Design a protein around this ligand. Structure first.
Ligand SMILES: *[C]C1=C([C])[C]=C2C(=[C]1)N([C][C]([O])[C]([O])[C]([O])[C]OP([O])(=O)OP([O])(=O)O[C][C]1O[C](N3[C]=NC4=C3N=[C]N=C4[N])[C]([O])[C]1[O])C1=NC(=O)[N]C(=O)C1=N2C#C[C][N][C]1[C][C]C2=C1[C]=[C][C]=[C]2
Ligand SMILES: *[C]C1=C([C])[C]=C2C(=[C]1)N([C][C]([O])[C]([O])[C]([O])[C]OP([O])(=O)OP([O])(=O)O[C][C]1O[C](N3[C]=NC4=C3N=[C]N=C4[N])[C]([O])[C]1[O])C1=NC(=O)[N]C(=O)[C@@]13=N2C3#C[C][N][C]1[C][C]C2=C1[C]=[C][C]=[C]2
Lengths: 494, 499
């Protein structure tokens, strides 16, 4: 019935918010809509797989908040397998390689690729992480889609295809679907193009021993019976002295403050009294999530390592169900598996199939790309279609279509009276990742702390010490990369 | 507690659905979230204004369903004043004219304007009204915004600037916010560019004597206490023998079937058991409504008629709060007023102002454009900002961004078990209008009737006899209009005759 702060949602952001408030002696209640905590993280357990991450899973250098939080909960990381060669599959042939970027040999193409990533990053530097709507050319950039920008920038089909894959892989949306300004912000606020794409030395380096879902689970363990499962919030009343929150089962909670720790658009599932301010009212109808099926095929052995492949595959073209894969074998070398994503529109198309039909396409595919009959002999299969999730809306995160970010961006984490906003969407570093989920939950927690005079203003946003277990090497560019002309730069010079 | 059909929402669509079901002896309940019926229609009454439509209001030729429905309810129409000259205000000057299109003299500009509207309509003909994702070039047209298309098509700033206002005016969104395919569909499904834009002989011709809100109010009168106000639906359970609907106040209804008659995106306010099928799950996060403030300034007289202006103004350029206006005087010639819309991003920006600050800007604006100091002397002011409405989400209707429509369009009116879908967004003729709202409610009603074996499949979609009070002239094109080259067509013809 009564407490200091009601937290709506038990994902990493909610749980992190609850923890920080509870470690300050406050009385918190987490209202979670599902019969489990974790949200967009979800670790499944059975005999066959032991455990498997079916949502959020990967963490890496510069992601210091999730690393710290998880360590404090007694969790450990291991490195994702990247010892042997990666494969780029393009126009139906596999080209093995090392390093993080696939090499390109043709001189003109080389220049077009070099200049594209470099322009991605150049544009990023003019975009403030904590207010992108304040980039100098924000309207110009917000009013075009990432496809218009690709058509403009890429003088070769090679470079344009790879850049489309990247966009698809990062935001589980089509380049036609998103704003150039939002996506350029997104990449920027994760440290730029190198940092975001890398396995070794970028966001894909590591996973958690036992499952990322143990982050939320263990916090729910720490909070005891303060966490209420199967409590979907349906009403929020801020007209009286205290905030009143009603859940679907008819329970009623009272607090001094509320934290909304759910995807922005899911605020649509709550009725408000008084009505939300006009900007936020319309903002929450204009901000959808990506579309992705996460798919994990199991094998007797990690057969690919025999051929000196690591399990990473970058797979070009429309016919391929899966554009990207990683080795999902346990650190001990057993439960051998390949993880792959079915992205954006392909997630919509391939959902019409049965589970067993998708398993077939993915093995046929992996057989082609790996050049192994062994790939046609799977022992087990798990998959998750996040588009069907009522209390997610999609995965991995929220994207902004044309025109929206500059109009409604500001509103995202603006408090509405006594409601404060967390969720990975409201983060300013690694937004859309687990890392950003911790950042935004701890910040909203400290906003309420401050509103209660417990801390000064300067302490609301707080920096994080570099992990000692997963330290970060800095991003470096060679002299030519930085200075070689673009294709039109080379034409102007000719 | 129990009935045949629960209808969520008592807007024109819900009310028309309810009426058709109840006229077949079925037991219906309308669950309306607000303390009033009419939703996006809303007639305000007071001494100062008598009445005023603050939401939907206009009807005209080819809109036979609303015309019939309202007539049966004992309502009458009158013609919006269009007797004297219209004004096109561009680059700070007013250029009076007659006949629904502002004329253009410059022959190069004239060619670009001609070819733009004509191309709008040409592209229309390739898009099916009832399945626009089936256009031959659907993906290509759906993956680009309306502003990419205008950059491509318009060889003059003159034509591009007017075409932007047209889009802003029709869909209360920016050109860069919407799909080229969706917008082309939208215009097409209203009869094409002429039909849509016209006051005389197009959708803006008339209003209802007394207010459009009387349509829903009178249906509520006819239905008695079946209409339940302040019942926002929060829950729908379809796991058992009957459908269970729970409202926010904790009431519970049981029916054999449900009709959702609320903006598509507003289905997000309902919790579903079992979960929605995946396409519809995500469809509803992907389809937002426009942004408009509807504004009516009142004067002692309709002073503009004295100067031989009818009250219509097409006002170009970024400094103007209002891009379009219409004479709102009562048909008796009293309660003299001007109606104007603040569109799209202008509605966001000018909401930060106070009610009295916006009245100033509009008056100053009207004064420049009418060249009248009397414009600066208002007697009364009423405005509605529909962006702030929780149970609308915007006005006038729902728009589809780049890539959505071909991916999620099919889903819009697909039943989910025993839930059937109405509301104007689901209509295939005049979608976005009060007309579309009637079309889609009567169709959903008949869907349920058919599911109950009461009517054959062929009776689900039904045509409508032409109104005799508001008959429709057909749309005609001159020989040059149809055949003159475009700017690039004229360049290729100059190129061919030398090189
Ligand atoms: C889904 C997904 C997947 C499949 C994958 C991924 C992901 C996802 N990610 C993301 C994550 O997961 C996220 O971000 C997080 O988790 C977030 O969180 P938050 O914010 O907290 O939220 P959530 O979780 O959702 O939760 C919330 C809650 O709430 C609730 N609710 C609702 N509503 C309601 C409620 N309650 C009450 N009431 C009401 N009404 C719900 O239920 C929930 O629970 C990720 N992340 C990271 O970090 N990592 C990873 O890995 C991930 N994943 C992935 C990623 C990928 N990456 C990639 C690879 C390759 C590449 C990339 C990128 C870039 C480049 C390259
Ligand atoms: C808002 C507006 C404005 C300002 C204007 C306009 C409009 C609007 N419009 C549109 C109309 O209004 C619409 O469409 C109708 O009304 C529809 O309806 P429906 O379908 O039925 O829907 P609604 O209304 O919304 O209703 C529903 C209901 O539901 C409810 N809910 C929610 N949620 C819930 C509920 N319940 C329970 N539960 C829950 N959960 C609500 O509350 C409601 O009630 C229009 N239309 C027409 O026809 N006309 C007119 O006039 C109108 N307006 C305008 C127009 C304009 N036009 C223009 C001028 C010039 C031009 C144009 C266009 C083009 C060219 C040129």
């Amino acid at each position: 019935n009564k407490c200091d702060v009601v937290v709506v949602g038990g994902g990493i952001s909610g749980m992190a918010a609850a923890k920080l408030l509870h470690d300050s002696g406050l009385n918190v209640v987490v209202l979670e809509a599902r019969d489990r905590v974790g949200g967009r993280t979800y670790t499944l357990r059975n005999q066959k797989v032991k455990y498997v991450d079916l949502g959020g899973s990967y963490v890496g250098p510069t992601q210091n908040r999730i690393l710290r939080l998880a360590k404090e909960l007694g969790l450990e990381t291991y490195k994702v397998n990247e010892v042997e060669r990666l494969i780029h599959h393009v126009k139906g042939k596999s080209y093995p390689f090392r390093g993080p970027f696939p090499p390109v040999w043709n001189p003109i193409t080389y220049l077009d690729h070099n200049n594209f990533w470099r322009t991605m990053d150049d544009m990023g530097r003019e975009i403030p992480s904590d207010a992108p709507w304040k980039a100098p050319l924000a309207e110009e950039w917000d009013n075009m889609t990432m496809k218009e920008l690709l058509d403009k920038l890429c003088w070769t089909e090679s470079a344009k295809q790879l850049a489309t894959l990247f966009v698809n892989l990062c935001v589980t949306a089509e380049t036609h679907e998103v704003s150039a300004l939002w996506f350029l912000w997104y990449v920027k606020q994760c440290g730029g193009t190198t940092r975001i794409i890398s396995t070794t030395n970028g966001g894909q380096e590591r996973k958690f021993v036992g499952g990322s879902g143990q982050v939320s689970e263990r916090i729910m363990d720490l909070l005891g019976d303060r966490v209420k499962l199967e409590r979907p919030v349906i009403y929020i009343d801020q007209t009286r002295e205290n905030v009143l929150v009603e859940t679907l089962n008819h329970e009623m909670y009272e607090a001094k403050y509320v934290i909304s720790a759910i995807p922005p658009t899911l605020g649509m599932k709550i009725h408000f009294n008084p009505p939300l301010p006009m900007m936020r009212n319309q903002m929450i109808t204009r901000v959808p999530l990506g579309s992705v099926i996460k798919c994990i095929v199991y094998y007797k052995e990690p057969f690919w390592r025999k051929k000196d492949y690591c399990g990473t595959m970058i797979i070009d073209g429309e016919e391929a169900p899966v554009a990207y894969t990683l080795d999902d074998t346990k650190p001990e070398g057993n439960y051998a598996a390949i993880m792959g994503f079915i992205l954006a529109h392909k997630a919509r198309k391939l959902a019409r199939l049965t589970k067993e039909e998708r398993l077939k396409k993915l093995c046929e595919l992996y057989a082609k790309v790996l050049g192994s009959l062994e790939a046609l002999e799977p022992v087990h299969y798990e998959e998750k279609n996040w588009c069907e999730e009522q209390y997610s809306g999609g995965c991995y995160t929220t994207y902004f279509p044309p025109g929206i970010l500059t109009q409604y961006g500001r509103v995202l984490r603006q408090p509405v009276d006594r409601i404060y906003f967390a969720g990975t969407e409201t983060a300013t570093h690694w937004s859309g990742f687990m890392e950003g989920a911790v950042e935004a939950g701890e910040r909203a927690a400290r906003e309420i702390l401050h509103a209660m005079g417990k801390i000064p203003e300067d302490e609301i946003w707080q920096s994080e010490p570099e992990s000692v277990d997963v330290p970060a090497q800095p991003i470096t560019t060679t002299f030519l990369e930085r200075h070689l002309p673009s294709v039109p730069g080379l034409l102007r010079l000719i």
